[PDB]
């Protein structure tokens, strides 16, 4: 009746929310994953995708990974991602501070990238590990 997309990481699982239409840039440039969309595998690079639940929109920021849909079942195997809704103020200031220091003397922009995905996988790992402990 609808689409079902779920994000997953090599360190743990993210979540599995519903959907209706997925539009985002891919290898060929344009990619459209729907619920009725037959079972096919695809690849995606570091970027963000726009999810269409039904009436509202939901965009997620995930690094380099792989995407594959099948029978209303999408699998995003990214090596570290993050949701725009799960963003904190301390984080932005943290990544900005460490970044400035990295480029200062440490490695160049390459350092910020490595640390970017690192924290991404760490955050999801924490929320996935201690999601709910009674």
From Swiss-Prot:
It is a peripheral membrane protein. It is found in: Cellular thylakoid membrane. The keyword Disulfide bond does not apply. Belongs to the ATPase epsilon chain family. Produces ATP from ADP in the presence of a proton gradient across the membrane. F-type ATPases have 2 components, CF(1) - the catalytic core - and CF(0) - the membrane proton channel. CF(1) has five subunits: alpha(3), beta(3), gamma(1), delta(1), epsilon(1). CF(0) has four main subunits: a(1), b(1), b'(1) and c(9-12). This is ATP synthase epsilon chain. The lineage of its organism: Bacteria, Bacillati, Cyanobacteriota, Cyanophyceae, Acaryochloridales. The gene is atpC. The chain holds residues 1 to 88 of 138 of the full protein.
């Amino acid at each position: 009746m609808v689409m079902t997309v779920r994000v997953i990481a090599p360190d743990k699982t993210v979540w599995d929310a519903p959907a209706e239409e997925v539009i985002l840039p891919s290898t060929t440039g344009q990619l459209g994953i729907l619920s009725n969309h037959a079972p096919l595998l695809t690849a995606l690079e570091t970027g963000v995708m726009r999810v269409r639940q039904d009436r509202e929109w939901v965009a997620i920021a995930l690094m380099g990974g792989f995407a594959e849909v099948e029978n209303n079942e999408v699998t995003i195997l990214v090596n570290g991602a993050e949701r725009g809704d799960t963003i904190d103020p301390q984080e932005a200031q943290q990544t900005l501070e460490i970044a400035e220091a990295n480029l200062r003397k440490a490695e160049g922009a390459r350092q910020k990238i490595e640390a970017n995905l690192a924290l991404r996988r760490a955050r999801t790992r924490v929320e996935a590990s201690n999601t709910i402990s009674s």
